[PDB]
């Protein structure tokens, strides 16, 4: 158990193809449910290979996690997990 955000609808991704775009990232997680928020984190105009995906229901996310957990992308295993700290911007 935990005392974080009530309902894990958003998730996190890492180790994404340098070419991997937002559009693809979305439709990619769509398989699970209806993706709403989808973007690709970047630094000074440089892909980081990490993004996020938000769903309509909290249950879905919990699923998309494992469903995509270790999804060999273009020969690159990605790390999918549920985001517990999705409140506000995440950057120093």
mmCIF file of N, CA and C in Angstrom:
data_model
loop_
_atom_site.group_PDB
_atom_site.id
_atom_site.type_symbol
_atom_site.label_atom_id
_atom_site.label_comp_id
_atom_site.label_asym_id
_atom_site.label_seq_id
_atom_site.Cartn_x
_atom_site.Cartn_y
_atom_site.Cartn_z
ATOM 1 N N UNK A 1 0.807 -1.206 0.000
ATOM 2 C CA UNK A 1 0.000 0.000 0.000
ATOM 3 C C UNK A 1 0.843 1.260 0.000
ATOM 4 N N UNK A 2 0.186 2.409 -0.126
ATOM 5 C CA UNK A 2 0.883 3.690 -0.145
ATOM 6 C C UNK A 2 -0.091 4.842 0.083
ATOM 7 N N UNK A 3 0.452 6.044 0.244
ATOM 8 C CA UNK A 3 -0.368 7.228 0.473
ATOM 9 C C UNK A 3 -0.056 8.312 -0.553
ATOM 10 N N UNK A 4 0.096 7.903 -1.809
ATOM 11 C CA UNK A 4 0.395 8.850 -2.867
ATOM 12 C C UNK A 4 -0.839 9.253 -3.651
ATOM 13 N N UNK A 5 -0.648 9.582 -4.924
ATOM 14 C CA UNK A 5 -1.754 9.992 -5.781
ATOM 15 C C UNK A 5 -2.843 8.924 -5.812
ATOM 16 N N UNK A 6 -4.081 9.343 -5.570
ATOM 17 C CA UNK A 6 -5.212 8.423 -5.567
ATOM 18 C C UNK A 6 -5.569 7.994 -6.987
ATOM 19 N N UNK A 7 -5.047 6.843 -7.399
ATOM 20 C CA UNK A 7 -5.321 6.340 -8.733
ATOM 21 C C UNK A 7 -4.142 6.510 -9.670
ATOM 22 N N UNK A 8 -3.462 5.408 -9.967
ATOM 23 C CA UNK A 8 -2.308 5.440 -10.858
ATOM 24 C C UNK A 8 -2.737 5.330 -12.317
ATOM 25 N N UNK A 9 -2.977 6.475 -12.946
ATOM 26 C CA UNK A 9 -3.397 6.506 -14.343
ATOM 27 C C UNK A 9 -2.219 6.832 -15.256
ATOM 28 N N UNK A 10 -1.266 7.596 -14.734
ATOM 29 C CA UNK A 10 -0.089 7.981 -15.504
ATOM 30 C C UNK A 10 1.058 7.004 -15.269
ATOM 31 N N UNK A 11 1.943 6.889 -16.254
ATOM 32 C CA UNK A 11 3.085 5.990 -16.155
ATOM 33 C C UNK A 11 4.358 6.658 -16.665
ATOM 34 N N UNK A 12 5.472 5.941 -16.577
ATOM 35 C CA UNK A 12 6.757 6.464 -17.030
ATOM 36 C C UNK A 12 7.463 5.460 -17.936
ATOM 37 N N UNK A 13 8.252 5.971 -18.876
ATOM 38 C CA UNK A 13 8.984 5.120 -19.805
ATOM 39 C C UNK A 13 10.430 5.582 -19.950
ATOM 40 N N UNK A 14 11.318 4.643 -20.261
ATOM 41 C CA UNK A 14 12.732 4.952 -20.427
ATOM 42 C C UNK A 14 13.372 4.034 -21.464
ATOM 43 N N UNK A 15 14.530 4.441 -21.973
ATOM 44 C CA UNK A 15 15.244 3.655 -22.973
ATOM 45 C C UNK A 15 14.448 3.574 -24.272
ATOM 46 N N UNK A 16 13.964 4.721 -24.735
ATOM 47 C CA UNK A 16 13.187 4.783 -25.967
ATOM 48 C C UNK A 16 14.067 5.179 -27.149
ATOM 49 N N UNK A 17 13.784 4.592 -28.321
ATOM 50 C CA UNK A 17 14.537 4.870 -29.548
ATOM 51 C C UNK A 17 14.720 6.365 -29.789
ATOM 52 N N UNK A 18 15.964 6.776 -30.006
ATOM 53 C CA UNK A 18 16.274 8.181 -30.250
ATOM 54 C C UNK A 18 15.295 8.788 -31.249
ATOM 55 N N UNK A 19 14.806 7.961 -32.166
ATOM 56 C CA UNK A 19 13.859 8.415 -33.179
ATOM 57 C C UNK A 19 12.434 8.406 -32.635
ATOM 58 N N UNK A 20 12.176 7.517 -31.681
ATOM 59 C CA UNK A 20 10.853 7.406 -31.079
ATOM 60 C C UNK A 20 10.243 8.784 -30.844
ATOM 61 N N UNK A 21 9.063 9.008 -31.413
ATOM 62 C CA UNK A 21 8.374 10.285 -31.268
ATOM 63 C C UNK A 21 7.191 10.165 -30.314
ATOM 64 N N UNK A 22 6.530 11.288 -30.057
ATOM 65 C CA UNK A 22 5.378 11.309 -29.161
ATOM 66 C C UNK A 22 4.194 10.576 -29.782
ATOM 67 N N UNK A 23 3.867 10.931 -31.020
ATOM 68 C CA UNK A 23 2.755 10.308 -31.727
ATOM 69 C C UNK A 23 2.815 8.788 -31.602
ATOM 70 N N UNK A 24 3.977 8.220 -31.906
ATOM 71 C CA UNK A 24 4.165 6.776 -31.825
ATOM 72 C C UNK A 24 4.003 6.286 -30.389
ATOM 73 N N UNK A 25 4.640 6.983 -29.455
ATOM 74 C CA UNK A 25 4.567 6.619 -28.045
ATOM 75 C C UNK A 25 3.117 6.454 -27.600
ATOM 76 N N UNK A 26 2.260 7.369 -28.041
ATOM 77 C CA UNK A 26 0.845 7.324 -27.691
ATOM 78 C C UNK A 26 0.178 6.087 -28.286
ATOM 79 N N UNK A 27 -0.048 6.116 -29.596
ATOM 80 C CA UNK A 27 -0.678 4.996 -30.286
ATOM 81 C C UNK A 27 -0.055 3.672 -29.855
ATOM 82 N N UNK A 28 1.181 3.735 -29.371
ATOM 83 C CA UNK A 28 1.889 2.542 -28.924
ATOM 84 C C UNK A 28 1.274 1.991 -27.642
ATOM 85 N N UNK A 29 0.902 2.890 -26.736
ATOM 86 C CA UNK A 29 0.299 2.494 -25.469
ATOM 87 C C UNK A 29 -1.219 2.413 -25.590
ATOM 88 N N UNK A 30 -1.744 2.886 -26.717
ATOM 89 C CA UNK A 30 -3.182 2.870 -26.958
ATOM 90 C C UNK A 30 -3.732 1.450 -26.868
ATOM 91 N N UNK A 31 -2.932 0.482 -27.308
ATOM 92 C CA UNK A 31 -3.340 -0.917 -27.278
ATOM 93 C C UNK A 31 -4.023 -1.257 -25.956
ATOM 94 N N UNK A 32 -3.434 -0.798 -24.858
ATOM 95 C CA UNK A 32 -3.984 -1.054 -23.531
ATOM 96 C C UNK A 32 -5.315 -0.333 -23.347
ATOM 97 N N UNK A 33 -5.273 0.995 -23.382
ATOM 98 C CA UNK A 33 -6.482 1.780 -23.216
ATOM 99 C C UNK A 33 -6.466 3.051 -24.042
ATOM 100 N N UNK A 34 -7.226 4.050 -23.604
ATOM 101 C CA UNK A 34 -7.298 5.324 -24.310
ATOM 102 C C UNK A 34 -6.283 6.315 -23.748
ATOM 103 N N UNK A 35 -5.182 6.499 -24.469
ATOM 104 C CA UNK A 35 -4.133 7.420 -24.043
ATOM 105 C C UNK A 35 -4.544 8.868 -24.283
ATOM 106 N N UNK A 36 -4.346 9.708 -23.273
ATOM 107 C CA UNK A 36 -4.695 11.121 -23.374
ATOM 108 C C UNK A 36 -3.442 11.984 -23.488
ATOM 109 N N UNK A 37 -2.600 11.934 -22.463
ATOM 110 C CA UNK A 37 -1.367 12.711 -22.448
ATOM 111 C C UNK A 37 -0.179 11.856 -22.879
ATOM 112 N N UNK A 38 0.596 12.368 -23.830
ATOM 113 C CA UNK A 38 1.765 11.655 -24.330
ATOM 114 C C UNK A 38 2.787 12.620 -24.920
ATOM 115 N N UNK A 39 4.007 12.578 -24.394
ATOM 116 C CA UNK A 39 5.075 13.450 -24.868
ATOM 117 C C UNK A 39 6.440 12.802 -24.654
ATOM 118 N N UNK A 40 7.459 13.353 -25.305
ATOM 119 C CA UNK A 40 8.814 12.829 -25.185
ATOM 120 C C UNK A 40 9.742 13.850 -24.534
ATOM 121 N N UNK A 41 10.276 13.497 -23.370
ATOM 122 C CA UNK A 41 11.182 14.379 -22.645
ATOM 123 C C UNK A 41 12.417 14.696 -23.481
ATOM 124 N N UNK A 42 12.832 15.959 -23.462
ATOM 125 C CA UNK A 42 14.004 16.390 -24.216
ATOM 126 C C UNK A 42 14.838 17.379 -23.408
ATOM 127 N N UNK A 43 16.123 17.469 -23.736
ATOM 128 C CA UNK A 43 17.028 18.376 -23.039
ATOM 129 C C UNK A 43 17.851 19.192 -24.030
ATOM 130 N N UNK A 44 17.625 20.502 -24.041
ATOM 131 C CA UNK A 44 18.345 21.394 -24.943
ATOM 132 C C UNK A 44 18.235 20.914 -26.386
ATOM 133 N N UNK A 45 17.080 20.353 -26.733
ATOM 134 C CA UNK A 45 16.868 19.861 -28.081
ATOM 135 C C UNK A 45 17.534 18.521 -28.320
ATOM 136 N N UNK A 46 17.530 17.670 -27.300
ATOM 137 C CA UNK A 46 18.138 16.348 -27.402
ATOM 138 C C UNK A 46 17.258 15.292 -26.741
ATOM 139 N N UNK A 47 16.823 14.312 -27.527
ATOM 140 C CA UNK A 47 15.973 13.243 -27.018
ATOM 141 C C UNK A 47 16.651 12.517 -25.858
ATOM 142 N N UNK A 48 15.879 12.234 -24.814
ATOM 143 C CA UNK A 48 16.402 11.543 -23.642
ATOM 144 C C UNK A 48 15.984 10.075 -23.645
ATOM 145 N N UNK A 49 15.004 9.746 -24.482
ATOM 146 C CA UNK A 49 14.532 8.376 -24.567
ATOM 147 C C UNK A 49 13.558 8.029 -23.458
ATOM 148 N N UNK A 50 13.069 9.050 -22.762
ATOM 149 C CA UNK A 50 12.125 8.847 -21.669
ATOM 150 C C UNK A 50 10.876 9.700 -21.863
ATOM 151 N N UNK A 51 9.711 9.077 -21.712
ATOM 152 C CA UNK A 51 8.460 9.794 -21.877
ATOM 153 C C UNK A 51 7.421 9.392 -20.849
ATOM 154 N N UNK A 52 6.191 9.858 -21.040
ATOM 155 C CA UNK A 52 5.104 9.542 -20.120
ATOM 156 C C UNK A 52 3.800 9.301 -20.873
ATOM 157 N N UNK A 53 2.916 8.508 -20.276
ATOM 158 C CA UNK A 53 1.630 8.199 -20.890
ATOM 159 C C UNK A 53 0.513 8.197 -19.852
ATOM 160 N N UNK A 54 -0.515 9.004 -20.096
ATOM 161 C CA UNK A 54 -1.649 9.095 -19.184
ATOM 162 C C UNK A 54 -2.881 8.420 -19.779
ATOM 163 N N UNK A 55 -3.624 7.708 -18.939
ATOM 164 C CA UNK A 55 -4.827 7.015 -19.382
ATOM 165 C C UNK A 55 -6.068 7.594 -18.709
ATOM 166 N N UNK A 56 -7.238 7.148 -19.154
ATOM 167 C CA UNK A 56 -8.499 7.623 -18.596
ATOM 168 C C UNK A 56 -8.758 6.997 -17.228
ATOM 169 N N UNK A 57 -8.519 5.693 -17.126
ATOM 170 C CA UNK A 57 -8.731 4.973 -15.876
ATOM 171 C C UNK A 57 -7.398 4.608 -15.227
ATOM 172 N N UNK A 58 -7.384 4.580 -13.886
ATOM 173 C CA UNK A 58 -6.182 4.246 -13.116
ATOM 174 C C UNK A 58 -5.796 2.777 -13.249
ATOM 175 N N UNK A 59 -6.800 1.917 -13.392
ATOM 176 C CA UNK A 59 -6.564 0.484 -13.529
ATOM 177 C C UNK A 59 -5.774 0.183 -14.800
ATOM 178 N N UNK A 60 -6.143 0.845 -15.891
ATOM 179 C CA UNK A 60 -5.470 0.649 -17.169
ATOM 180 C C UNK A 60 -3.959 0.790 -17.022
ATOM 181 N N UNK A 61 -3.521 1.965 -16.582
ATOM 182 C CA UNK A 61 -2.100 2.229 -16.395
ATOM 183 C C UNK A 61 -1.400 1.035 -15.754
ATOM 184 N N UNK A 62 -1.850 0.662 -14.560
ATOM 185 C CA UNK A 62 -1.265 -0.464 -13.841
ATOM 186 C C UNK A 62 -1.020 -1.641 -14.781
ATOM 187 N N UNK A 63 -1.868 -1.767 -15.796
ATOM 188 C CA UNK A 63 -1.746 -2.850 -16.765
ATOM 189 C C UNK A 63 -0.704 -2.512 -17.829
ATOM 190 N N UNK A 64 -0.917 -1.401 -18.525
ATOM 191 C CA UNK A 64 0.003 -0.967 -19.569
ATOM 192 C C UNK A 64 1.453 -1.082 -19.106
ATOM 193 N N UNK A 65 1.667 -0.927 -17.805
ATOM 194 C CA UNK A 65 3.008 -1.012 -17.236
ATOM 195 C C UNK A 65 3.659 -2.349 -17.578
ATOM 196 N N UNK A 66 3.073 -3.432 -17.079
ATOM 197 C CA UNK A 66 3.598 -4.768 -17.329
ATOM 198 C C UNK A 66 3.502 -5.122 -18.809
ATOM 199 N N UNK A 67 2.382 -4.761 -19.426
ATOM 200 C CA UNK A 67 2.165 -5.041 -20.842
ATOM 201 C C UNK A 67 3.297 -4.468 -21.689
ATOM 202 N N UNK A 68 3.840 -3.334 -21.254
ATOM 203 C CA UNK A 68 4.930 -2.686 -21.973
ATOM 204 C C UNK A 68 6.254 -2.879 -21.241
ATOM 205 N N UNK A 69 6.174 -3.308 -19.985
ATOM 206 C CA UNK A 69 7.368 -3.532 -19.177
ATOM 207 C C UNK A 69 8.336 -4.473 -19.887
ATOM 208 N N UNK A 70 9.461 -3.925 -20.340
ATOM 209 C CA UNK A 70 10.453 -4.728 -21.030
ATOM 210 C C UNK A 70 10.137 -4.899 -22.503
ATOM 211 N N UNK A 71 9.371 -3.964 -23.055
ATOM 212 C CA UNK A 71 8.996 -4.017 -24.463
ATOM 213 C C UNK A 71 10.190 -3.688 -25.355
ATOM 214 N N UNK A 72 10.831 -4.726 -25.883
ATOM 215 C CA UNK A 72 11.987 -4.549 -26.754
ATOM 216 C C UNK A 72 11.671 -3.577 -27.886
ATOM 217 N N UNK A 73 12.127 -2.338 -27.739
ATOM 218 C CA UNK A 73 11.895 -1.312 -28.751
ATOM 219 C C UNK A 73 13.124 -1.132 -29.637
ATOM 220 N N UNK A 74 12.951 -1.361 -30.935
ATOM 221 C CA UNK A 74 14.046 -1.225 -31.887
ATOM 222 C C UNK A 74 15.343 -1.780 -31.306
ATOM 223 N N UNK A 75 15.249 -2.940 -30.665
ATOM 224 C CA UNK A 75 16.420 -3.559 -30.073
ATOM 225 C C UNK A 75 16.847 -2.881 -28.786
ATOM 226 N N UNK A 76 15.893 -2.255 -28.105
ATOM 227 C CA UNK A 76 16.176 -1.562 -26.854
ATOM 228 C C UNK A 76 15.057 -1.786 -25.842
ATOM 229 N N UNK A 77 15.362 -2.536 -24.787
ATOM 230 C CA UNK A 77 14.379 -2.825 -23.749
ATOM 231 C C UNK A 77 14.031 -1.565 -22.962
ATOM 232 N N UNK A 78 12.737 -1.282 -22.854
ATOM 233 C CA UNK A 78 12.272 -0.107 -22.128
ATOM 234 C C UNK A 78 11.804 -0.477 -20.725
ATOM 235 N N UNK A 79 11.917 0.470 -19.800
ATOM 236 C CA UNK A 79 11.502 0.245 -18.420
ATOM 237 C C UNK A 79 10.199 0.977 -18.117
ATOM 238 N N UNK A 80 9.092 0.242 -18.146
ATOM 239 C CA UNK A 80 7.782 0.821 -17.875
ATOM 240 C C UNK A 80 7.365 0.583 -16.428
ATOM 241 N N UNK A 81 6.835 1.623 -15.792
ATOM 242 C CA UNK A 81 6.394 1.528 -14.406
ATOM 243 C C UNK A 81 5.374 2.615 -14.083
ATOM 244 N N UNK A 82 4.660 2.438 -12.976
ATOM 245 C CA UNK A 82 3.652 3.404 -12.555
ATOM 246 C C UNK A 82 4.294 4.608 -11.875
ATOM 247 N N UNK A 83 3.843 5.801 -12.245
ATOM 248 C CA UNK A 83 4.371 7.031 -11.668
ATOM 249 C C UNK A 83 3.594 7.421 -10.414
ATOM 250 N N UNK A 84 4.283 7.435 -9.278
ATOM 251 C CA UNK A 84 3.656 7.788 -8.010
ATOM 252 C C UNK A 84 3.783 9.284 -7.739
ATOM 253 N N UNK A 85 4.791 9.906 -8.341
ATOM 254 C CA UNK A 85 5.022 11.336 -8.164
ATOM 255 C C UNK A 85 4.810 12.088 -9.475
ATOM 256 N N UNK A 86 3.554 12.192 -9.893
ATOM 257 C CA UNK A 86 3.216 12.889 -11.129
ATOM 258 C C UNK A 86 2.531 14.220 -10.839
ATOM 259 N N UNK A 87 2.788 14.768 -9.655
ATOM 260 C CA UNK A 87 2.192 16.037 -9.254
ATOM 261 C C UNK A 87 3.145 17.196 -9.530
ATOM 262 N N UNK A 88 2.862 17.948 -10.589
ATOM 263 C CA UNK A 88 3.702 19.076 -10.944
ATOM 264 C C UNK A 88 4.871 18.675 -11.822
ATOM 265 N N UNK A 89 5.668 19.668 -12.243
ATOM 266 C CA UNK A 89 6.836 19.438 -13.098
ATOM 267 C C UNK A 89 7.960 18.715 -12.363
ATOM 268 N N UNK A 90 8.668 17.848 -13.079
ATOM 269 C CA UNK A 90 9.767 17.091 -12.493
ATOM 270 C C UNK A 90 11.097 17.478 -13.133
ATOM 271 N N UNK A 91 11.719 18.525 -12.603
ATOM 272 C CA UNK A 91 12.995 19.002 -13.125
ATOM 273 C C UNK A 91 13.663 19.956 -12.140
ATOM 274 N N UNK A 92 14.951 19.736 -11.893
ATOM 275 C CA UNK A 92 15.685 20.583 -10.971
ATOM 276 C C UNK A 92 15.556 22.055 -11.309
#
